[PDB]
Coordinates of C-alpha atoms in Angstrom, one line a residue:
Chain A
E6 CA 194.3 24.5 22.9
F7 CA 191.2 25.9 24.3
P8 CA 190.9 29.2 23.1
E9 CA 191.2 32.8 24.4
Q10 CA 188.1 34.7 25.4
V15 CA 177.4 33.3 25.5
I16 CA 178.6 31.0 28.3
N17 CA 179.5 31.5 32.0
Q18 CA 182.9 33.2 32.2
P19 CA 183.8 31.7 35.6
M20 CA 182.9 28.1 34.6
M21 CA 184.9 28.5 31.5
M22 CA 187.7 29.9 33.5
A23 CA 187.6 26.9 35.7
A24 CA 187.2 24.6 32.7
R25 CA 190.3 26.2 31.1
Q26 CA 192.5 26.1 34.2
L27 CA 192.0 22.3 34.5
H28 CA 192.5 21.9 30.8
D29 CA 195.9 23.6 30.9
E30 CA 197.2 21.5 33.8
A31 CA 196.3 18.2 31.9
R32 CA 197.4 19.3 28.4
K33 CA 200.9 19.6 30.0
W34 CA 201.0 15.8 29.6
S35 CA 200.3 13.1 27.0
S36 CA 197.1 11.1 27.5
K37 CA 198.7 7.9 26.2
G38 CA 198.8 5.4 29.1
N39 CA 197.5 7.9 31.6
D40 CA 193.7 7.7 32.0
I41 CA 193.8 10.2 34.8
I42 CA 194.9 12.8 32.1
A43 CA 192.3 11.5 29.6
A44 CA 189.5 11.8 32.1
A45 CA 190.7 15.2 33.3
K46 CA 190.7 16.5 29.7
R47 CA 187.2 15.1 29.3
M48 CA 185.8 16.8 32.5
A49 CA 187.3 20.1 31.3
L50 CA 185.5 19.7 28.0
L51 CA 182.2 18.9 29.7
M52 CA 182.7 21.8 32.1
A53 CA 183.0 24.1 29.1
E54 CA 179.7 22.5 27.8
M55 CA 178.2 23.4 31.1
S56 CA 179.0 27.1 31.1
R57 CA 177.2 27.1 27.7
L58 CA 174.2 25.0 29.1
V59 CA 174.0 27.4 32.1
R60 CA 172.5 30.1 29.8
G61 CA 170.5 27.6 27.6
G62 CA 167.1 28.8 28.7
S63 CA 165.5 25.5 27.7
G64 CA 166.1 22.2 26.0
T65 CA 169.1 22.6 28.3
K66 CA 167.1 20.9 31.2
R67 CA 167.8 17.4 30.0
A68 CA 171.2 18.2 28.7
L69 CA 172.3 20.1 31.9
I70 CA 171.3 17.0 33.8
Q71 CA 173.0 14.5 31.6
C72 CA 176.1 16.7 31.5
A73 CA 176.5 16.8 35.3
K74 CA 176.0 13.0 35.3
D75 CA 178.8 12.7 32.7
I76 CA 181.1 14.8 34.8
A77 CA 180.5 12.6 37.9
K78 CA 181.3 9.6 35.8
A79 CA 184.7 11.2 34.9
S80 CA 185.5 12.1 38.5
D81 CA 184.6 8.6 39.7
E82 CA 187.4 7.4 37.4
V83 CA 189.9 10.0 38.5
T84 CA 189.3 8.9 42.0
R85 CA 189.4 5.2 41.3
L86 CA 192.8 5.5 39.5
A87 CA 194.2 8.1 42.0
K88 CA 193.6 5.4 44.6
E89 CA 195.4 2.6 42.7
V90 CA 198.3 5.0 42.5
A91 CA 198.2 5.8 46.2
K92 CA 198.0 2.0 46.9
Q93 CA 201.3 1.7 45.0
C94 CA 203.0 4.7 46.6
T95 CA 205.7 4.0 49.1
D96 CA 205.8 7.5 50.5
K97 CA 203.5 8.1 53.5
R98 CA 203.9 11.9 53.0
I99 CA 202.7 11.7 49.4
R100 CA 200.3 8.7 49.7
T101 CA 198.6 10.8 52.3
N102 CA 198.2 14.0 50.4
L103 CA 196.9 12.0 47.5
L104 CA 194.2 10.3 49.4
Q105 CA 193.3 13.6 51.1
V106 CA 192.6 15.5 47.9
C107 CA 190.9 12.8 46.0
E108 CA 188.4 11.9 48.7
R109 CA 186.5 15.1 48.3
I110 CA 186.1 14.6 44.5
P111 CA 183.0 12.2 44.7
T112 CA 181.4 14.6 47.2
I113 CA 181.9 17.7 45.2
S114 CA 180.8 15.8 42.1
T115 CA 177.6 14.8 43.9
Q116 CA 176.8 18.3 45.1
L117 CA 177.3 19.2 41.4
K118 CA 174.5 16.7 40.3
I119 CA 172.2 18.1 42.9
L120 CA 172.9 21.7 42.2
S121 CA 172.4 21.1 38.5
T122 CA 169.1 19.6 39.1
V123 CA 167.7 22.6 40.9
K124 CA 169.1 24.8 38.2
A125 CA 167.5 22.7 35.5
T126 CA 164.0 22.9 36.9
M127 CA 164.5 26.6 37.5
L128 CA 165.2 27.0 33.8
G129 CA 162.1 28.3 32.1
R130 CA 160.5 29.5 35.3
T131 CA 159.2 33.0 35.4
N132 CA 157.7 32.9 38.9
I133 CA 161.1 32.1 40.5
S134 CA 162.7 35.1 42.2
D135 CA 165.6 37.1 40.8
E136 CA 167.8 36.5 43.9
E137 CA 166.9 32.8 43.8
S138 CA 168.0 32.2 40.3
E139 CA 171.3 34.1 40.3
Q140 CA 172.1 32.3 43.6
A141 CA 171.3 28.9 42.1
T142 CA 173.8 29.7 39.3
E143 CA 176.5 30.9 41.7
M144 CA 176.5 27.7 43.8
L145 CA 177.0 25.8 40.6
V146 CA 180.0 28.0 39.6
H147 CA 181.3 27.6 43.1
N148 CA 181.0 23.8 43.1
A149 CA 182.5 23.7 39.5
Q150 CA 185.4 25.9 40.6
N151 CA 186.2 23.5 43.4
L152 CA 185.6 20.3 41.4
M153 CA 188.1 21.6 38.9
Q154 CA 190.6 22.6 41.5
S155 CA 190.3 19.2 43.1
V156 CA 190.8 17.3 39.9
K157 CA 193.9 19.3 39.1
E158 CA 195.3 19.0 42.6
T159 CA 195.0 15.2 42.1
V160 CA 196.8 15.1 39.0
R161 CA 199.7 16.6 40.5
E162 CA 199.9 14.7 43.4
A163 CA 199.3 11.6 41.3
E164 CA 202.3 12.6 39.3
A165 CA 204.4 13.1 42.4
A166 CA 203.3 9.7 43.8
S167 CA 204.4 8.1 40.5
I168 CA 208.0 8.6 41.6
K169 CA 208.5 6.0 44.4
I170 CA 206.8 2.8 43.3
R171 CA 206.5 -0.3 45.5
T172 CA 206.7 -2.7 42.5
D173 CA 207.0 -1.8 38.8
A174 CA 204.7 -4.8 38.4
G175 CA 201.7 -3.1 40.0
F176 CA 199.9 -0.1 38.5
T177 CA 201.6 2.8 36.7
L178 CA 200.4 5.8 34.8
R179 CA 202.5 7.3 32.1
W180 CA 203.9 10.7 32.9
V181 CA 205.3 12.1 29.7
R182 CA 205.3 15.8 29.1
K183 CA 204.0 17.1 25.8
Chain B
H1 CA 171.2 24.1 -1.7
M2 CA 174.8 23.3 -0.6
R3 CA 176.0 20.1 0.9
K4 CA 177.6 21.6 4.0
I5 CA 175.8 21.3 7.3
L6 CA 176.8 22.6 10.7
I7 CA 175.8 20.7 13.9
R8 CA 175.4 22.6 17.3
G9 CA 174.7 21.2 20.7
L10 CA 177.0 18.2 20.6
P11 CA 178.2 16.7 24.0
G12 CA 181.3 18.0 25.8
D13 CA 183.0 14.7 25.5
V14 CA 181.8 14.0 21.9
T15 CA 184.3 12.1 19.7
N16 CA 184.7 12.3 15.9
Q17 CA 183.5 8.7 15.7
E18 CA 180.2 9.6 17.4
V19 CA 179.6 12.2 14.6
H20 CA 180.4 9.7 11.9
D21 CA 178.2 7.2 13.7
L22 CA 175.5 9.7 13.9
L23 CA 175.5 10.3 10.2
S24 CA 176.4 6.7 9.4
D25 CA 173.7 6.8 6.7
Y26 CA 175.5 9.4 4.6
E27 CA 178.8 10.0 2.7
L28 CA 181.0 12.2 4.7
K29 CA 183.4 14.2 2.5
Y30 CA 184.4 16.5 5.3
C31 CA 184.2 16.4 9.1
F32 CA 185.6 18.8 11.6
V33 CA 184.5 18.5 15.2
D34 CA 185.1 21.4 17.6
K35 CA 185.3 19.8 21.0
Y36 CA 185.6 23.2 22.8
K37 CA 182.4 24.4 21.0
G38 CA 180.4 21.2 20.6
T39 CA 179.9 22.0 17.0
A40 CA 180.7 19.9 13.9
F41 CA 181.3 21.0 10.3
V42 CA 180.3 18.2 8.1
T43 CA 180.2 18.2 4.3
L44 CA 178.0 15.7 2.6
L45 CA 177.9 14.1 -0.9
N46 CA 175.3 16.5 -2.3
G47 CA 172.3 18.8 -1.8
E48 CA 169.9 16.0 -1.1
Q49 CA 172.1 14.3 1.6
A50 CA 172.5 17.6 3.4
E51 CA 168.7 17.9 3.3
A52 CA 167.9 14.5 4.6
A53 CA 170.6 14.9 7.3
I54 CA 169.1 18.2 8.5
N55 CA 165.6 16.7 8.5
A56 CA 166.5 13.4 10.3
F57 CA 168.9 15.2 12.8
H58 CA 167.7 18.7 13.5
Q59 CA 166.2 18.7 17.0
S60 CA 167.1 15.1 17.8
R61 CA 168.8 14.0 21.0
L62 CA 172.4 12.8 21.2
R63 CA 173.1 11.5 24.5
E64 CA 170.5 13.6 26.1
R65 CA 171.5 16.7 24.2
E66 CA 169.2 18.4 21.7
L67 CA 170.9 18.9 18.3
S68 CA 170.5 21.7 15.9
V69 CA 171.5 20.7 12.4
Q70 CA 171.3 23.3 9.7
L71 CA 172.9 24.4 6.4
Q72 CA 176.4 25.9 7.1
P73 CA 175.6 29.6 7.6
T74 CA 176.5 31.1 4.3

């Protein structure tokens, strides 16, 4: 429900790739999916902000902060799922992929800051500015890839549950 | 002029509620939020409401994002 194709093609691409993996499921009773959908929507806002020129400084910053908020919740919940999983194979893969999330999301706040201050500047070099933007896209690509890998191993680890009493996300295909 | 305004620059994770809260001081007759575009299409009670909305809300900040409120491009 994001649509086909003044943004940043590769950020929107990454935004869309996450969106599609999470739109596969209903958000109802699955905050992992709700958060994932949110991040994807804020990633899209970012490719837009990445052209912004100015007035985008403050926004670009807030936006990156927003995103990190969303990942912190994907992680937090991914962990409760892993804590309920009874399959070492899966419980492991889950923790593995969701550990990096926080890190990637932090690189993202940092990279976005440099980018923000660079916005407006005329003195900054050509090579410097297109490079700032490409580390952003790179980090964004990997943040999205990580969030979507979680969601899939979160779903896999929803299968063998220690107690139906503990935590549970709702996995209902749309 | 008209009573239709269009808002640009909304947050990525904006909700319809937030828009309605934003313009809590007006009578919404129509309200369509485009989450993929961060743009809203509101329709107000009359010419004056659309004016006051534009004036209060063009260039203000919504969660750290600068808004651009203007008459729906006709």
